[PDB]
């Protein structure tokens, strides 16, 4: 589409043809194959200069060597031009270093908001009170329970004498809200506690959610960021359960510790718990609610763009951006490795509108060839087949490759083959998902893109980029035990996917695309979709890419800081 193409070219102009800091890139044609390299070093970049100064002073102060760009082999960073990134869909121009997750509070807070969150059913707990104690559960008792719960959950006492408690100023991001597919109950819930499904979602999407979950009621729990940071993901469901248990004891005048309480515990910790993600095997051992356990469908549902946009490509692209950041920068780039990590492996998929350009081109191609199949609808989709995948994925990949070739600036931008592979395959996969409403047809398109890419340029990604991509096409429609899975249910622990950058965010976008093209309310779990339909959370999950930009310009306020108890 024309508007996105113009945006892409403007990004290339800003990045390469006007100066950033002191890089002296004061002019140029963005289609030019040649350039002058000025060998200025890191001092051309104002953020790098700031870092060098801090590194020197801290090394001097602490008495052991620290950051020093002259320790780099041969020469310091920036012998060619250090150039900025524009967050896709925005005009936010970023210092490259400001998009490293360590330097970006928005990125860290997005993960904390996911890590510190779980969902716990109320119905089992209420049935327990009714059966074992003969208690009558009403809107009144529920609303009282919820006020008690929102006192207790941040870490405050409701039963015992002589308790110490968390300081409210340190845990102000902690709260519990409820949602319910029972409209009659929703009308009776104190609105301060309610996530209103009928209010937050379109009538069609609300209907899908409510039909999915039935007349069931749920708690969206967000424990303190400061606790999540001190501990881990597996903390979350335990923390929620402890304070749910205390609040039921207090609010319903139970014995503070009787057999019926144990049923509430098992209900909260197991039977009626929905985690963001499940545990991981020994080699990458982690408990629940860590990035590796977060299925691609679940991320697609945490991201809120599907709720606020009718553009199926935009919805998919926001999920790609959120996924590439989380899965590659924080998960694979830190949890599973560390160091400098994988910032630009991810930024390639959410900056400079290159992925967006390829994707929106595909949408126009699909709409033109397949009677508007990429427009929102459930009955205008093309039947998934090898033929349709080959058509769309080949066209997508050829266009994207030609764009990299016609704009040398775009090629230098995405200088790593892996970055280009992620972009080309994400566009091709998202396209195939949009057209078919079949996420695994999207996966097939992803892998075909990789295969065409490899033969086109005689190269693909890094050394071990295409482990999963060569296993890819054959495992898309396999029904063998550890091979078969709908993409919605796949995740970072799907065996082929367990290691490598440049994929997981794309697969999340492919899962989302299959359902955004249909106008679906959710990709795999309505409970998560409603849970994060809440503006009180510090991270705006409706605009994840833009949020990364707000972090880069230091305008994002995170939770969990300790300045209250830190000296002057």
């Amino acid at each position: 589409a024309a508007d996105i193409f113009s945006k892409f070219k403007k990004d290339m102009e800003v990045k390469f043809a006007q100066e950033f800091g002191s890089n002296k890139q004061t002019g140029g044609d963005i289609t030019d194959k040649t350039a002058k390299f000025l060998r200025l070093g890191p001092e051309q970049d104002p953020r790098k200069v700031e870092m060098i100064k801090a590194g020197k002073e801290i090394a001097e102060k602490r008495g052991i060597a620290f950051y020093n760009p002259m320790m780099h082999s041969g020469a310091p960073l920036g012998q060619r031009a250090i150039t900025p990134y524009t967050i896709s869909g925005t005009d936010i121009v970023c210092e490259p270093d400001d998009l490293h997750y360590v330097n970006n509070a928005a990125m860290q807070q997005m993960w904390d908001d996911i890590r510190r969150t779980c969902i716990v059913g109320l119905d089992m707990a209420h049935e327990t009170l009714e059966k074992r104690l003969g208690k009558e559960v009403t809107p009144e008792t529920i609303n009282h329970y919820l006020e008690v719960l929102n006192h207790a959950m941040p870490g405050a006492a409701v039963v015992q004498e002589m308790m110490v408690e968390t300081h409210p100023a340190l845990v102000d991001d902690c709260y519990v809200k409820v949602f319910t597919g029972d409209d009659a109950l929703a009308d009776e819930i104190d609105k301060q506690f309610l996530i209103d499904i009928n209010k937050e979602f379109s009538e069609e999407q609300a209907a899908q959610i409510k039909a999915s979950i039935g007349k069931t009621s749920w708690q969206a729990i967000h424990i303190p960021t400061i606790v999540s940071r001190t501990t881990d993901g597996a903390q979350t469901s335990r923390w929620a359960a402890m304070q749910i248990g205390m609040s039921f004891i207090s609010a319903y005048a139970m014995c503070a510790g009787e057999a019926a309480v144990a049923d509430l515990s098992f209900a909260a910790k197991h039977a009626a718990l929905v985690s963001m993600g499940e545990m991981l095997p020994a080699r990458r051992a982690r408990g629940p609610n860590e990035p590796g356990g977060l299925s691609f469908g679940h991320l697609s549902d945490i991201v809120q763009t599907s709720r606020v946009s009718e553009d199926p490509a935009k919805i998919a692209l926001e999920v790609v951006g959120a996924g590439c950041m989380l899965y590659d920068q924080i998960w694979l780039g830190s949890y599973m490795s560390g160091g400098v990590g994988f910032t630009q492996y991810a930024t390639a998929a959410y900056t400079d509108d290159i992925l967006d350009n390829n994707t929106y081109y595909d949408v126009d191609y699909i709409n033109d060839k397949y009677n508007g199949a990429a427009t929102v609808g459930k009955d205008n989709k093309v039947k998934a087949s090898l033929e349709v995948v080959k058509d769309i994925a080949t066209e997508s990949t050829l266009y994207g490759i030609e764009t990299y070739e016609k704009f040398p600036t775009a090629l230098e931008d995405h200088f790593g083959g892996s970055q280009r592979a992620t972009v080309l395959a994400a566009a091709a996969g998202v396209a195939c998902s949009l057209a078919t409403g079949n996420a695994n047809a999207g996966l097939s398109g992803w892998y075909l893109s990789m295969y065409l890419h490899k033969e086109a340029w005689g190269r693909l990604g890094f050394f071990g980029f295409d482990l999963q991509d060569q296993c890819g096409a054959t495992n898309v429609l396999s029904y063998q035990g550890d091979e078969g899975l709908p993409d919605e249910l796949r995740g970072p622990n799907y065996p082929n996917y367990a290691m490598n950058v440049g994929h997981q965010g794309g697969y999340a976008g492919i899962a989302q695309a299959a359902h955004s093209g249909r106008g679906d309310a959710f990709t795999v779990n309505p409970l998560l979709k409603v849970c994060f339909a809440d503006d009180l959370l510090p991270f705006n999950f409706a605009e994840p890419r833009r949020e990364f930009g707000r972090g880069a310009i230091r305008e994002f306020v995170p939770a969990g800081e300790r300045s209250l108890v830190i000296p002057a």
Binding site: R80, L386, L411, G458, R459, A473
Partner: protein
């Protein structure tokens, strides 16, 4: 008796790919043994190959059929260290592309450990064996020394805009155009050489476009080589079908 066909396609790019895979490469320039050893940087020119273990003939081997039937290379027999040569190749019509350097090595040389990446391609092998492979890569059309560079570290350049003199960017400036010829005066990890190595005059952009194994929309477009696109489609279809049911 099977005659290998190597690769599909009927363009200059496909023809060049078959040349690289089959090892039928035109010799374009010369490099002395000592200069090759110098640019590789693993030992002083003319010195004995260091070893990582004793010669096979000294320590002996297990008697199994594979060791008896498969001849050890001269480098294995000598117990050489495994060392390497690594190239970066410009996407602006460098003769070589990473996968096709690796095919070249795998098909034409014994006891090699090729690795393909987007910005670097490497052959690891017993040092003296590696030097044999290195010499062919240095001397023949598979390498243009303006559009490519021998880089064991800090390889950035394959996707960067070319310099106006047609040479691919090197962060560490190991080789450049001097008086119309490519001079390399550092080894592949950028340690300065005692004597600079003349790697010959670069190909014109015109010749590079004719010799290249890379497709580009402004030379020979991938889209235009129908046989290669069909090959991809057939591999994709078959892999997908047989993953469901191998029949």
């Amino acid at each position: 008796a099977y005659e290998r066909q190597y690769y599909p396609g009927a363009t200059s790019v496909a023809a060049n790919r078959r040349k690289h895979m089959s090892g039928k490469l035109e010799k374009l320039r010369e490099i002395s043994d000592e200069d090759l050893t110098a640019v590789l940087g693993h030992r002083a020119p003319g010195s004995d190959y260091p070893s990582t273990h004793p010669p096979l003939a000294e320590m002996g081997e297990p008697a199994c059929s594979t060791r008896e039937n498969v001849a050890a290379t001269p480098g294995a027999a000598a117990g050489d260290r495994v060392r390497y040569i690594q190239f970066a190749d410009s996407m602006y019509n460098a003769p070589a592309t990473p996968y096709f350097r690796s095919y070249f090595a795998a098909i034409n040389f014994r006891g090699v450990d090729p690795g393909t990446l987007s910005g670097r391609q490497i052959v690891e092998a017993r040092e003296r064996d590696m030097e044999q492979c290195a010499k062919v890569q240095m001397e023949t059309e598979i390498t243009d020394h303006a559009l490519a560079g021998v880089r064991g570290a800090t390889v950035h350049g394959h996707s960067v805009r070319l310099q106006e003199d047609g040479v691919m960017f090197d962060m560490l400036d190991r080789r450049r155009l001097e008086n119309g010829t490519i001079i390399m005066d550092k080894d592949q990890v950028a340690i300065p050489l005692d004597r600079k190595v003349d790697l010959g005059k670069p190909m014109s952009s015109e010749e590079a476009a004719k010799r290249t194994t890379i497709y580009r929309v402004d030379n020979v477009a991938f889209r235009d080589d129908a046989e290669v696109v069909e090959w991809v489609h057939r591999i994709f279809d078959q892999r997908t079908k047989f993953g469901f049911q191998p029949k």
